[PDB]
């Protein structure tokens, strides 16, 4: 059974946490203990191929700016996440992508852009703007809602598809 | 025989327990045999914080550490005063029983809460002088001879709080290599004794780890816009760590001669070895991070010349971080103070705990505070504190200490500019294949041989 090592990157106050928590937890429990192993590993079926996701989310460690390379090196694929109500987190994406490319020493790293909606303030990044950015990078864009679980599976599964295409 | 309190109409904490106001986890408070509260209304949480049947130190600590997400300080104080001020039910016998077994115990428990609040969370009062005003007048109000002792004790604590290291036996001898004592101008990575570098960084980093309070962590405040106001000690700690990692990278990539660079990397691995002996895991990871950095990790010609013993040391340390810190975590559980944990794990667990659980649970349409979420957060802050009580048996050296405090590898540069400079420097000293490897001249006019990692003199 194939195992995909995914890494989530993004600015603080963006709900990166929620994105990964909502993947892993049951569609109908709001409960989570991040201390146990099942916290960050999930078995899933994607395009009828069963596989294992291992997801690294270092949310809260953003100030350890010199550990990013170490954490990024662990991944095969990356979710670059911004919040639709924070323009600065969106403008920061360029920098995260550049750093990933340098860490993996590759121009073509499996990657998806993810814009996350939580709660107010209101949207400052129109999805058009993100579609345009994602397109300039040659990567998919997925918009998600923390609280309704809309888009969350799509975001991770799309990244897994990107890894498969890259490997073949 | 039950006890007959007053009507809830006159005393809100008389309301009976029900599925709609208080719920429990299926298991029992360990050591104590008390039920574990899962959720409740604030009324019920406060009832239980000052419960008449028994004392609940665990719940008191946990509550006082975490309450501010769901109850303002001023609100809490108003509630414990209301709790204190117990009327009698309307028409001896049951009366005497009611004073001795309901009123007296509850009043004592309220006083116990005040004492803990003031002793361990005095920051609520430093930040809101009116809160302290109200606490002082409440306390001055309190009547009984049963109460005198606790009241006097609380008052003494308040006074102590308004007011503005030497060892068990001998610490080891301070170690010197090329730089002599006093000669702060000569101090550098290779000229100080690697043992002492690691000792003095461990002392700094221990003090940094120890200054961080739960008030800087609960509510994930270090990630919010007021982080510099609310988490200043945490942030200094992290900045120091980052600074050191960057200084290691810089030392490496600015040493252009291959042989000298091998000496530098090798010396860093020696410092890591000593951090490891000292259980300074923050020190350990600041080296691992540097070695994993994109400017350093790619230096295959340098790595190739590192003696295999030290390769193995570095590789073992890297492995601590793998599989989500599996080996780091096991190693940490298994050692005894003193140590310096890596803080990052705690930060992520606190954040994910708070983000991944609801603030309230609903039952029969009624909103209950999710207390178990707070308990989990307090367990993490409690684990942090257990490693904060025990200092290292090492003598400070105030010049070496100052050297590392004032380290500033970035200078006036912004992050991006600086890390690009490190990476470009890496490319210059060991170009990409297929470019051939250049030679560069030596920059160090003193000897490169390490004095090693064993104490030079006995006992
Ligand atoms: C000093 C040069 O750095 C390296 O080349 C290096 C460091 C590592 C660890 C930290 C992952 C063990 O692995 C390498 C192999 N490139």
The full DSSP string for A71-104 is HHHT-SEEEEEEETT-HHHHHTHHHHHHHHHHHT
From ligand 1's centre to the CA of A80, what distance in Å? 26
> Is B167 inside any structural domain?
no
- Closest approach of B291 to chain A, Cα-based (Å): 9
User: Which residues of A fall within a CB distance of 8 Å from B218?
Assistant: none
Q: What are phi and psi of A115, to 5 degrees?
A: -105, 125
d(CA A75, CA B26) in angstroms, rounded, equals 39
User: Which residues of A fall within a CB distance of 8 Å from B242?
Assistant: 63-66
CA dihedral of B48, B49, B51, B56, whole degrees rounded to 10: 110
> Is B236 inside any structural domain?
yes
From ligand 1's centre to the CA of A166, what distance in Å? 26
Which one of B334, B359, B386 terminates a domain?
B386
- Closest approach of B239 to chain A, Cα-based (Å): 7
DSSP β-bridge partners for residue B23: B39
- Cβ of B140 under 8 Å from any chain A Cβ? no
The CATH number of whichever domain residue B21 belongs to comes to 1.20.870.10
> Is B266 inside any structural domain?
yes
Tokens of A73: 């090196």
Q: Which of A93, A112, A115 is nearest to A14 (CA)?
A: A115
- Closest approach of A160 to chain B, Cα-based (Å): 19
> Is B408 inside any structural domain?
yes
Q: In this structure, are residues A94 and A126 in contact, taking their beta carbons and an 8 Å threshold?
A: no
User: Which residues of B fall within a CB distance of 8 Å from A39?
Assistant: 352
DSSP β-bridge partners for residue A83: A116
Structural domains present in chain A? 1-168 (3.40.50.300)
Which one of B386, B411, B438 terminates a domain?
B386
B14 to A33, B95, B108: CA distances (angstroms): 35, 16, 18
d(CA B212, CA B232) in angstroms, rounded, equals 8
A18, A33, A60 ranked by CB distance to B347: nearest = A60
The CATH number of whichever domain residue B224 belongs to comes to 1.10.840.10
> Is B102 inside any structural domain?
yes
Tokens of B305: 């010349």
Residue B407 CB neighbours (<10 A): 14
Are A66 and B416 a contacting pair at CB < 8 A?
no
CA-nearest residue, atom 2 of ligand 1: B303
d(CA A133, CA A127) in angstroms, rounded, equals 10
CA B335 from centroid of its chain's CA atoms: 17
The chain A residue lying nearest B243, using CA atoms, is A66
B305 to A6, B161, B258, B294: CA distances (angstroms): 33, 57, 9, 19
* Residue B341 three-state SS: coil
Does residue B319's CB lie within 6 angstroms of at least one atom of ligand 1?
no
Of B291, B310, B313, the one to substitute when testing ligand 1's pocket (max ligand atoms within 8 A of C-beta) is B291
d(CA B274, CA B268) in angstroms, rounded, equals 10
| Residue B443 and residue B377 share a domain | no
d(CA A100, CA A80) in angstroms, rounded, equals 10
Q: In this structure, are residues B244 and B201 in contact, taking their beta carbons and an 8 Å threshold?
A: yes
| Residue B281 and residue B334 share a domain | yes
> Is B268 inside any structural domain?
yes
Q: Which of B256, B247, B240 is nearest to B424 (CA)?
A: B256
Does residue B296's CB lie within 6 angstroms of at least one atom of ligand 1?
yes
| Residues on A contacting B at a C-beta cutoff of 8 Å | 12-13, 15, 17-18, 21, 25, 30-35, 39-40, 56-67, 69-70, 73-74, 95, 99, 102-103, 105
| Residue B280 and residue B374 share a domain | no
From ligand 1's centre to the CA of B315, what distance in Å? 8
Q: Which of B351, B377, B423, B431 has the most A C-beta neighbours within 10 Å, making it the best mutation to test the interface with A?
A: B351
d(CA B55, CA B110) in angstroms, rounded, equals 11
d(CA B318, CA B312) in angstroms, rounded, equals 10
| Residue B138 and residue B179 share a domain | no
d(CA B192, CA B172) in angstroms, rounded, equals 16
Contacts (Cβ under 8 Å, ≥6 apart) of B7 = B14, B89
User: Largest Cα–Cα distance of chain B, in whole Å?
Assistant: 100
Tokens of B174: 């301070």
Which one of B386, B404, B419 terminates a domain?
B386
| Residue B93 and residue B199 share a domain | no
Q: Which atom of ligand 1 is nearest to the CA of A73?
A: 11
Q: In this structure, are residues A159 and A79 in contact, taking their beta carbons and an 8 Å threshold?
A: yes
Q: In this structure, are residues A63 and B238 in contact, taking their beta carbons and an 8 Å threshold?
A: yes
DSSP β-bridge partners for residue A56: A7
User: Which residues of A fall within a CB distance of 8 Å from B249?
Assistant: 66
Q: Which of B346, B349, B352, B371 is nearest to B360 (CA)?
A: B371
Q: How many CB pairs under 8 A join A and B?
A: 99
Q: Cβ-count burial of B147 within 10 angstroms (0-12 exposed, 13-18 middle, 19+ buried)? A: middle
Residue B344 CB neighbours (<10 A): 20
- Cβ of B236 under 8 Å from any chain A Cβ? no
Provide the chain B residues 336-355 that lie in CB contact (below 8 A) with chain A: 344, 347-353, 355
Are B355 and A61 a contacting pair at CB < 8 A?
no
d(CA B187, CA B420) in angstroms, rounded, equals 27
The radius of gyration of chain B from alpha carbons, rounded to an integer in Å, stands at 29
d(CA B16, CA B3) in angstroms, rounded, equals 12
Q: Which of A167, A89, A73, A103 is nearest to A133 (CA)?
A: A89
Angle of the B145-162 helix axis to the B104-120 helix axis, nearest 10: 10
Q: In this structure, are residues A100 and A113 in contact, taking their beta carbons and an 8 Å threshold?
A: no
* Domain hosting residue B363, numbered range: 4-162+344-386
d(CA B328, CA B318) in angstroms, rounded, equals 10
Are A61 and B353 a contacting pair at CB < 8 A?
no
| Residue B66 and residue B198 share a domain | no
Q: Which of A22, A26, A66, A92 has the most B C-beta neighbours within 10 Å, making it the best mutation to test the interface with B?
A: A66
Q: In this structure, are residues B321 and B328 in contact, taking their beta carbons and an 8 Å threshold?
A: yes
Residue length of chain B: 459
Are B289 and A56 a contacting pair at CB < 8 A?
no
Are A12 and B223 a contacting pair at CB < 8 A?
yes
Residue length of chain A: 168
| Residue B21 and residue B55 share a domain | yes
* Residue A54 three-state SS: strand
| Residue B138 and residue B40 share a domain | yes
Does residue B300's CB lie within 6 angstroms of at least one atom of ligand 1?
yes
| Residue B258 and residue B325 share a domain | yes
DSSP β-bridge partners for residue B368: B361
Instruction: Outline where DSSP puts E strands in B78-219.
Output: none
Instruction: Outline where DSSP puts E strands in chain A.
Output: 3-10, 41-46, 49-57, 77-83, 111-117, 141-145
User: Which residues of A fall within a CB distance of 8 Å from B332?
Assistant: none
* Residue B45 three-state SS: helix
Our count of domains for chain B comes to 2
| Residue B288 and residue B212 share a domain | yes
Are A60 and B238 a contacting pair at CB < 8 A?
no
DSSP β-bridge partners for residue A117: A145
d(CA A141, CA A111) in angstroms, rounded, equals 9
| Residue B408 and residue B286 share a domain | yes
* Residue B175 three-state SS: coil
| Residue B74 and residue B36 share a domain | yes
CA dihedral of B371, B372, B375, B379, whole degrees rounded to 10: -170
Of B271, B288, B297, the one to substitute when testing ligand 1's pocket (max ligand atoms within 8 A of C-beta) is B297
The chain B residue lying nearest A70, using CA atoms, is B292
């Amino acid at each position: 059974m194939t195992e995909y090592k995914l890494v989530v990157v993004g600015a603080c106050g963006v709900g990166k946490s929620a994105l990964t928590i909502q993947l892993i937890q049951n569609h109908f429990v709001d409960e989570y203990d991040p201390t146990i192993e099942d916290s960050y590993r999930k078995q899933v079926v994607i395009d009828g191929e069963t596989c294992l996701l291992d997801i690294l989310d270092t949310a809260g460690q953003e100030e350890y700016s010199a550990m990013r390379d170490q954490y990024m090196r662990t991944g095969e694929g990356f979710l670059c996440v911004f919040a639709i109500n924070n323009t600065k987190s969106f403008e920061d994406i360029h920098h995260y992508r550049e750093q990933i490319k340098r860490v993996k020493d590759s121009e073509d790293v499996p990657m998806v852009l993810v814009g996350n909606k939580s709660d107010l303030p209101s949207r400052t990044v129109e999805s058009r703007q993100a579609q345009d950015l994602a397109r300039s990078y040659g990567i998919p864009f997925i918009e998600t809602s923390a609280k309704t679980r809309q888009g969350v599976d799509d975001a991770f599964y799309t990244l897994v598809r990107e890894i498969r295409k890259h490997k073949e | 025989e039950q006890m007959r309190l007053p009507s809830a109409d006159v005393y809100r904490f008389a309301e009976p327990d029900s599925e709609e106001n208080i719920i429990f986890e299926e298991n029992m408070q360990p050591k104590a045999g008390i039920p574990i509260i899962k959720a409740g209304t604030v009324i019920k949480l406060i009832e239980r914080l000052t419960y008449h049947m028994y004392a609940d130190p665990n719940f008191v600590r946990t509550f006082l550490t975490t309450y501010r997400s769901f109850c303002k300080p001023q609100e809490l104080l108003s509630l414990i005063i209301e709790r204190f001020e117990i009327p009698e039910p309307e028409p001896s016998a049951e009366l005497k029983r009611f004073r001795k077994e309901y009123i007296q115990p509850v009043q004592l428990r309220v006083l116990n809460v005040c004492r803990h609040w003031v002793e361990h969370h005095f920051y609520d009062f430093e930040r809101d002088a009116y809160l302290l005003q109200r606490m002082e007048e409440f306390i001055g109000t309190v009547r009984g001879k049963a109460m005198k002792k606790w009241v006097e004790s609380i008052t003494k604590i308040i006074q102590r709080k308004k007011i503005a290291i030497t060892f068990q036996s001998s610490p080891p001898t301070v170690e010197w290599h090329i730089s002599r004592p006093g000669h702060i101008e000569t101090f550098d990575l290779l000229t100080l004794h690697p043992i002492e570098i690691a000792r003095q960084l461990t002392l700094l980093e221990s003090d940094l780890y120890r200054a961080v309070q739960p008030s800087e962590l609960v509510g994930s405040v270090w990630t919010k816009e007021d982080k510099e106001i609310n988490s200043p000690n945490l942030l200094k700690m992290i900045r120091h760590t980052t600074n050191l990692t960057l200084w290691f990278e810089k030392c490496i990539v600015e040493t252009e001669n291959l042989e000298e660079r091998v000496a530098v990397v090798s010396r860093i691995i020696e410092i890591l070895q000593v951090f490891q002996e000292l259980n300074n895991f923050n020190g350990v990871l600041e080296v691992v991070s540097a070695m994993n950095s994109s400017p350093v990790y790619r230096l295959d010609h340098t790595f190739e010349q590192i003696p295999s013993r030290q390769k193995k040391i570095l590789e073992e340390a890297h492995e601590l971080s793998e599989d989500h810190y599996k080996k780091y975590l096991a190693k940490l559980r298994s050692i005894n103070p003193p140590c310096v944990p890596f803080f990052g794990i705690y930060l992520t667990n606190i954040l994910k705990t708070e983000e991944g659980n609801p603030e309230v649970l609903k039952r029969h349409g009624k909103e209950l505070i999710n207390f178990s979420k707070r308990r989990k957060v307090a367990e993490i802050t409690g684990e942090i504190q257990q490693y904060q009580n025990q200092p290292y048996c090492l003598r400070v050296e105030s010049d070496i200490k100052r050297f590392f405090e004032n380290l500033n590898p970035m200078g006036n540069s912004m992050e991006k500019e600086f890390t690009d400079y490190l990476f470009n420097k890496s490319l210059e000293i060991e170009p990409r294949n297929p470019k051939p490897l250049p030679r560069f001249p030596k920059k160090y006019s003193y000897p490169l041989k390490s004095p090693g990692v064993r104490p030079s003199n006995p006992r």
